[PDB]
């Protein structure tokens, strides 16, 4: 059973701006997703202090970067707190609305796209490099869900029938044809070293066979 | 009834470094506390989506900057989620430990003190300008508490007997003798405009009588 939702107009407007604006510094999407993974890892780690059973779904706190040249996908995996079904829908809600409006106002006032994270809408920078984003997530208090959007004003949410992940979030970036540099080991390493050098969790870049 | 706690050694070491290192760019403490206020405001705002009764303790989501030249205090007030007694004690816990160690390692490797926030220990930059920090906080699920530390390896936690605050956190920076520039309106405005221009909550600088 697949549910389709409309993005609110300001978010749909933001997504179309990110897709259609000429902006060469596209590498910033990686920093934004890694930052969000690190925030989700902080959340589970903090909850696990007062309640250690929160880690029964997995004690390992890490980030994996998995490029796949055959599928043309860059997957970002984390074992953070994950997202509930309500969380997925709310990522296109009120906080995202005020943040989107403030960011687009800042862009009009001369700010640049790399400042997206300061408005809490950093996720949408995935659309600088991806024609489609698939998010697989599992929170301790809910089932495993698959969120997906190719922009165009909508996203879908379905219960995931795939392999269980224990806990966390998997971001599958279905890369645009001209954005395959983000599948190269040396390029990924360069971006991680430049923007995410101080992340408090092991970031593992997977090698392809 | 006042409870006294020891900071763990790495945090006590960090605090002594912040107090004794020659570092002229002290203004960064304001950005760190405002950033933490904004994060606490995001948390209550997000919780209020699925549960509107979370805002019965106050619907207003803001940050107030209150300098007081007579008391030599700069107070930062927010109506964020606030902190429980467990939260106050855990601010000197495991997450703070790994973050402190990583930050001090980065400093050895040539990083500078302004990067403190990337390690989640941004609060401790208050000790660049304050000889003592008093924190008054109220979370919906707990009583009102007063946290206090003049560094020296310890902090205290007591139930606050003062005026109720509804919900949020009040940071009272008892400024060092040579740090009174942070009580001047034009100086505060300059720092807010430079470092916190994109905060998603109204920041009000109070004028003195
Ligand atoms: C529908 C899009 C979801 N994303 C891919 S995301 O928001 O970039 C993103 C979200 C999470 C996430 N899991 N749990 C959680 O609380 N978060 C979270 C963290 C920071 C900010 C907002 C958030 F919800 C993550 O681990 C990685 C991500 O790349
Ligand atoms: C003992 C020191 C407490 N501080 C003064 S603080 O951490 O800088 C600080 C904390 C809060 C706070 N309230 N609720 C909450 O979750 N937080 C929080 C936000 C971000 C990071 C860690 C945190 F706990 C705040 O609103 C303002 C602050 O200046």
Curated annotation (Swiss-Prot), chains A, B:
The modification N6-acetyllysine is found at residues 43, 69. It is found in: Nucleus; Cytoplasm; Melanosome; Cell membrane. ISGylated. Residues 1-209 are annotated as: Interaction with NR3C1. ATP binds at residues 36, 78, 97, 123. Coiled coil: none annotated. Changing residue 82 to D: Abolishes ATPase activity. Homodimer. Identified in NR3C1/GCR steroid receptor-chaperone complexes formed at least by NR3C1, HSP90AA1 and a variety of proteins containing TPR repeats such as FKBP4, FKBP5, PPID, PPP5C or STIP1. Forms a complex containing HSP90AA1, TSC1 and TSC2; TSC1 is required to recruit TCS2 to the complex. The closed form interacts (via the middle domain and TPR repeat-binding motif) with co-chaperone TSC1 (via C-terminus). Interacts with TOM34. Interacts with TERT; the interaction, together with PTGES3, is required for correct assembly and stabilization of the TERT holoenzyme complex. (Microbial infection) Interacts with herpes simplex virus 1 protein US11; this interaction inhibits TBK1-induced interferon production. Belongs to the heat shock protein 90 family. The TPR repeat-binding motif mediates interaction with TPR repeat-containing proteins like the co-chaperone STUB1. Molecular chaperone that promotes the maturation, structural maintenance and proper regulation of specific target proteins involved for instance in cell cycle control and signal transduction. Undergoes a functional cycle that is linked to its ATPase activity which is essential for its chaperone activity. This cycle probably induces conformational changes in the client proteins, thereby causing their activation. Interacts dynamically with various co-chaperones that modulate its substrate recognition, ATPase cycle and chaperone function. This is Heat shock protein HSP 90-alpha. It comes from Homo sapiens (Human). The chain holds residues 16 to 224 of 732 of the full protein.
